[PDB]
Design a protein around this ligand. Structure first.
Ligand SMILES: *[C@@H]1O[C@H](CO)[C@@H](O[C@@H]2O[C@H](CO)[C@@H](O[C@@H]3O[C@H](CO)[C@@H](O)[C@H](O)[C@@H]3O)[C@H](O)[C@H]2NC(C)=O)[C@H](O)[C@H]1NC(C)=O
Lengths: 141, 35
């Protein structure tokens, strides 16, 4: 690896002669809020972003436009898993910063939450989420 | 007791009688072998 995450001085201090620049961070989504809330200096420097989704960002990176991409964990892992050859993310076990999870958003205090949540717990309990992982999210590398 | 602050596992059997909170650490299940 070349960068130790969000604590490296290269990211934390954008004043290098060789300025490793333009992590994707598609604007006006979710991780941009975290960046703009915690440390404003990247958000100030970070302007050479991508105007499209990961699909354009990955080809731009392969073409040499930018050398770093900062985005979600699951989608980036899937993209890396489904590729000719392989494009490697940083150390995967430690590449999950600001851990959270997906979920279903409903109206404030609705009675469905009592049942659908327990259904989801059951689903994770019997292993029926597991073979969905095999079927839908897999790659060669 | 009025609260449980401990490594409590969230599952179906407990959610029927308890209102939990969002997880603060994810974990799974492994096995221990002497080596
Ligand atoms: C993030 O929020 C912005 C806020 O609207 C979303 O739209 C972008 O914001 C710009 C700046 O307000 C908008 O520019 C507009 O462009 C039209 C056509 O050129 C012009 O007639 C207007 O007066 C205004 O300047 C525009 O709606 C849009 N930006 C572009 C380049 O189209 C944006 O969709 C949200 N999400 C993202 C990922 O940016």
């Amino acid at each position: 690896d070349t960068v130790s995450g969000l604590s490296d001085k290269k990211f934390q201090r954008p004043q290098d002669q060789y300025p490793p620049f333009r992590f994707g961070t598609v604007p006006n989504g979710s991780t941009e809020r975290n960046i703009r809330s915690n440390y404003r200096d990247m958000h100030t420097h970070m302007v050479k972003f991508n105007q499209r989704s990961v699909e354009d960002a990955l080809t731009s990176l392969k073409m040499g436009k930018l050398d770093a991409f900062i985005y979600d964990a699951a989608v980036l892992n899937y993209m890396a898993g489904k590729d000719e050859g392989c494009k490697l993310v940083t150390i995967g076990s430690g590449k999950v910063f600001a851990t959270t999870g997906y979920g279903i958003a409903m109206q404030k205090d609705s009675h469905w939450k009592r049942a659908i949540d327990l259904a989801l717990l059951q689903f994770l309990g019997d292993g029926e989420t597991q073979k969905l992982e095999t079927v839908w999210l897999s790659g060669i590398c | 007791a009025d609260m449980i602050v401990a490594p409590l596992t969230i599952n179906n059997e407990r959610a029927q009688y308890i209102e939990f909170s969002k997880p603060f650490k994810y974990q799974g299940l492994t096995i221990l072998v002497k080596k």
